[PDB]
Structures are given as structure tokens and as C-alpha cells.
Ligand binder design. Structure first.
Ligand SMILES: [Cl-]
Ligand SMILES: [Cl-]
Ligand code: NA
Lengths: 361, 361
């Protein structure tokens, strides 16, 4: 059984260091908001080329906190792609803002920047850009729109750790960015984890407070805060793995290129990489998706759909069910993710391509 | 220096077992919502005598989830002691409910049951009892009241793991209970951690979904949920320690009773318990609190204040600052916590008593 994402394979490279750092943190007696958090933050900040990195409990928290720290009014509007993972939207509604859902470009799977301005209203306060599947969004126009209409840009970076746009990294393309380090992400923890990145000193300091109960100083609560912190253990594990993140992303680039160069099947539309793509998810598109998934499973290849029901169609968002978003809806009916990881064996990726080429419907 | 809480001493007993479990989880390649969580949950349910335990990310999330799951209307009222830790109140306001702050009994530091009924209104939906410092609340009148008015009882168990009221454990004394396993809790993780306990099947399934993005089935989101999970690793650490929790609590009793029997100083009011007490914190009370804390530090003994500013006085709740709660305010001006731990050295507790006896002020 070739697994969709073999984490033990990804992480076995680091066991001996992992155990070392664990023992160290044991030796320290310090498990929360300590020197491993500081060290990881400082390194990830350098990595994204930003001034400030605040470790938090997960990527949904990271998003929810950024939105919270802006103090928007109830029903203020945040423009967001309609085809993202639900978490992006959950962060908006958690904060009693209104998500304004924009169709993607079929050629990027990212928000179509040409479709945003028409949806901008007096209630709009932000654009949440999502670098979906690993590919950075085309920022040029979004940035112009944000300057023009006095909007914040919030990056959801949970799928594109390390992707580059012009001179900058994801995380440094907007006003503030949220990252997930859930274990299957291109930089994955061994438990839940997240961070926020920004260059603004005041904003960063406010975020630190809000993620630690609303307290800047012992005994005192300046804001109504959250408990959303990155555990020492998880910061340590992340820092060890961050050293090899670009390498890992490159190993993904190699497998994706192999897929792109070798899968030749009329029933399958392959993903393109118009801008930098770190290939978190290798997403193909076919009118016979569920059939493909079954076929692959029959050949001992596990595949997972990202994603089959779009946020507007979910039961939790009944009041959005009527929205007509046919590009999003078609994608959701048609996509399927092929196994990819930095450690994935040659024999395994060759088998995926060979079996796809044999699929004859 | 005698530190207020030496987690290295608490935890070093278990170091070999922690390391064993960590490797086992590395072997598993399964870090979230797995077998360690299930095992721990099962054992903590047993420990509390409840049907269901849901591990979640922290004790504040645990409370916030419980209130969320009840789906109360905006400005629905929740009665709550006025002198608890701010997390108890944060859970209420986050959910857009109005906290109705009740004075404690000066002789228990828990909510005075006799002061609740007069504050009940048509908008009241719940009573959140807090077992402060480790002492269980006198539950009988509270349970009768909730039944009389069709209110939910929410237990904030963050500080009282394993305390017993008549025939039941804290966690099994209302409709649903929230627990913190913050590292310095009587049952402390190595990272942030918490849980929710309940006997109600439907509430338990709803909470599991609300803690996992609102998802009860792969690809579907029934609710607008959040991400609040207990890492496999922390579940494993908690399960190791849980087997020693009653032993450890009784060891804390022995030390507290030593303090109670041996400290005699006209300047200090001891925390004589009226109900079972697992002594998470051992809180004394003096008119010269700031002078006391300095004196102890002069004698190389670290103390902390639980707590110096009450919620209604915090800058984050300026809409509550006007409230006249003099018992609460008095407590906050006069309390200080002394070091206690089930592994605390005899010379250390003896020192603390002797040095306090010598204090002439
Ligand atoms: Cl996440
Ligand atoms: Cl076949
Ligand atoms: Na966590």
C-alpha cells in the first residue's frame, strides 16, 4: 500500500535529533514560551524575510488572531477565494466578518485577481489571499487593489511554505500572514502548530498579547485574548526540519516535474506552475474523478481529494449554499491529489505515473 | 532559590517512560487524534466517573467549546464567580454571552451559592462553577438551583483535578466540565493541553466535531468549528502521570496540612478548607501582602499571586470596572500563594513554615 503521505518516512531522517532535543527540553523544565520557541521564531522570520514571527497553536488560530487583532466591525467584509480549504473561511466567520467569495483562475487554482474589484464595497476591510496547493498567488494586482481601497492583505500560507514571488517569500507579501505546521504540511510538526508573520512592530506585539490570554505583562489583561501558543517541543522539531525545507520543497519539485513529463492521459488535466510552486499537493483534474480514485486504490495507491465539497456548499454554511460559483463547483467535482512528498521513493512515483498512463476509460 | 513550582522535580520521575512513549509515537507516525488520545481519554473518563472525555488543545478552549456547543443566544447570561482566573470569564464573553459576577464566600474563596438566585433572570442559561485553588464548590444548592431554573452547570475544573464532593469527582458534578492540563496543573502536560468531560452522548459527539473544524465526517463540516486537539504526545505523557494523580494529590494534602498545622502568625490567614481540597495552590491572606512576598524573596523563597487584579478590574473589561465587588477586591489585595508540590522536599516545606513563623511585620 503506497500511502498518500507517509509521515514516518518524512520524519525518520530526524529521529536522533528529535530525541536529543526532547531530552534537552526535559532537562530544561520549560515547556511553554521558552528558548525553543524564540529560536524557531527568529529562524522562521529570517526564512520568510520578515521582521516578526509569533508561534501559535495552529494555522486556523493564526488566521483567526490576525483578523481579531484588526478589530473589524461585525459584518465587515473579507474577500477570499471560494475554492480554498474551509479553514480560511472559518477564520473570517469566527470573527463575525462576512466572507466574500471569489472564483479562482482555472490556470492557477488561486483567486482570479481580475474578479476582486467588482466585489469591493464600503464594508470591505481585507483581502485574504491563499497560496493554494503550494503555488504563490499573483500578487501584482491584489497589492494595487489593497493600496487603492485601503485594504489589509492577509496571507493564508498553510500550503506554500517557502514559495517565492519576485524578491519575496510567502509570509512577506501582505500585511500579515498565517502558517500551519500541521504534520502533513511542507514544514510539519509532530502535533498541532502554527505561526503568524508580519513586519509591523505594534501589530506583532498585539498578536503576542492576544495569543497569551490578552496579556503583555504578568497579572494584566489588556485585551480579550486566546490561549494559542507553539509548544517548546514542537518549536524544537520545527527548527530541526526548517534547515531542510528548501531542499524538501525541491524534492517535491522533482517528483512533480516527473509527473508532468511522464503522465500522458487524455482523461487527466495536469497542474501547471505559472509562478513558484512548492507542490504541497499535486492536483489533477478529470471528469471521472471518483472512478480514478477507485482505480488507483485497486492498484494499491492511496489518493485523497482536496477538495470535494466547497465551503459555500457545506452544511455549516447553509446561508451560502445558494451562491453560484461554477468554476469552484466544477473543480470540486473533478480534482484528486496524487501522492507526493520530499522522501517519496522513485519506484513509487514511477508506479503512479505508469498506472495513470494505463488508465483507459 | 526555592522556586514556586519546580516542574523538573515533578517530571523527572517519569523521564524514562516519557522517552519510551515518544519513540512509540515516532514508530506510529501518527501524531494527531490517535490511539494515545483515545487511551488517555478513556482513562480520564474513568478517573472522573463520566461517560465521555474529549481531549482538546487547552482549558480555555475546553470552556469556550462547552459554551459554544450549547448555542446560547447573544447576551444570554452565565453566572460565574467574580474572583476566578480570567480564563473563566474569557470563555463567556468570546461566546458573546454576558457574565454575571457573583461574590465568593470569604472562607472558601469559591462562589457563594446563597448569592446566585437573586441574580438569575429570564436571560440566565448557565452557572459556571469554579473549583478554585483545588477546593470543590459546595455543589448541593447549585445543583438544586440549576434544576429549579433549567440552567446548565458548567464546571471549570482547571485547578481541582480529582477533588471529590460527596460521592462524585469534580468533572461529574454538572452538565459538562472543562479541564486544563497546563504544565503546572495537578495533572500537567509537557505543552498546552485540556479536555472536556460529560455524560451526554450528543454533547460529546458535538464537542468532538466542534474541536475538529466542525467535522464529524471526512470532507464535511456540519458546524463552524475550530481546531482544538490534544497532541498524541501530550496524551501519552498525561496517561503516564494519571496513574499517580490520587497518590500525588494525597501527598499535596499532607504538605498543606503541615502548613495548616505549623504556620502560626497573627498577620496571616490560612486557607482552612470547608470541602475536599487537592491544593493546586496554597493561598494565604494578609494585610501586608506586598511586604510578605518581599520578605520571603529575601529568604530566597519564590511566591506568586493568584491573583492581584480581578477580572472586572482588567483593562480588557472596562465595561465591568464600575462593579462593586468588595470581597473579591479584598481577596485580590491580600492573597499570596506558597510553594507546594507532591514531590516537594521536607526541608523546603519546613523552611517555608519556619520562616513565616519568624515574620514580625
Ligand atoms: Cl492547522
Ligand atoms: Cl485495472
Ligand atoms: Na497544542
Amino acid at each position: 500500500h503506497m500511502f498518500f503521505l507517509n509521515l514516518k518516512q518524512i520524519n525518520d531522517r530526524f529521529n536522533t535529533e528529535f530525541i536529543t532535543k526532547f531530552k534537552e527540553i526535559l532537562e530544561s523544565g520549560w515547556y511553554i514560551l521558552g528558548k525553543q520557541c524564540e529560536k524557531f521564531e527568529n529562524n522562521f522570520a529570517k526564512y520568510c524575510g520578515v521582521k516578526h514571527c509569533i508561534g501559535v497553536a495552529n494555522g486556523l488560530d493564526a488566521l483567526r488572531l490576525i483578523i481579531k487583532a484588526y478589530d473589524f466591525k461585525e459584518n465587515d467584509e473579507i474577500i477570499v477565494p471560494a475554492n480554498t480549504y474551509i479553514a480560511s473561511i472559518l477564520a473570517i466567520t469566527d470573527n463575525k466578518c462576512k466572507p466574500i467569495l471569489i472564483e479562482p483562475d482555472i490556470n492557477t487554482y488561486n483567486i482570479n485577481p481580475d474578479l476582486i474589484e467588482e466585489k469591493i464595497t464600503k464594508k470591505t476591510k481585507a483581502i485574504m489571499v491563499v497560496h493554494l496547493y503550494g503555488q504563490v498567488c499573483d500578487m501584482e494586482k491584489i497589492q494595487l487593489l489593497a493600496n487603492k481601497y485601503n485594504l489589509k492583505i492577509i496571507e493564508d500560507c498553510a500550503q506554500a511554505h517557502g514559495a517565492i514571488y519576485k524578491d519575496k517569500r510567502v509570509g512577506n507579501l501582505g500585511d500579515a500572514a498565517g502558517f500551519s505546521f500541521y504534520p502533513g504540511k511542507n514544514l510539519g510538526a509532530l502535533g498541532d502548530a502554527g505561526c503568524i508573520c508580519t513586519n509591523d512592530d505594534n501589530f506583532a506585539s498585539k498578536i503576542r498579547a492576544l495569543a497569551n490570554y490578552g496579556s503583555h505583562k504578568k497579572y494584566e489583561n489588556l485585551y480579550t485574548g486566546l490561549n494559542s501558543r507553539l509548544d517548546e517541543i514542537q518549536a524544537a522539531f520545527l527548527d530541526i526540519k526548517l534547515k531542510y525545507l528548501d531542499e524538501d520543497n525541491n524534492k517535491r519539485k522533482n517528483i512533480a516535474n516527473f509527473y508532468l513529463q511522464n503522465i500522458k492521459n487524455e482523461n487527466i488535466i495536469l497542474p501547471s506552475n505559472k509562478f513558484d510552486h512548492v507542490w504541497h499537493l499535486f492536483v489533477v483534474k478529470t471528469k471521472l474523478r471518483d472512478e480514478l480514485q477507485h482505480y488507483l486504490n485497486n492498484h494499491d495507491i492511496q489518493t485523497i481529494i482536496h477538495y470535494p465539497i466547497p465551503p459555500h456548499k457545506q452544511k455549516c454554511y447553509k446561508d451560502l449554499n445558494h451562491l453560484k460559483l461554477p468554476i469552484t463547483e466544477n473543480i470540486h467535482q473533478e480534482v484528486l491529489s496524487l501522492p507526493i512528498s520530499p522522501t517519496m521513493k522513485e519506484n513509487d512515483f514511477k508506479k503512479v505515473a505508469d498506472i495513470l498512463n494505463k488508465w483507459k476509460v
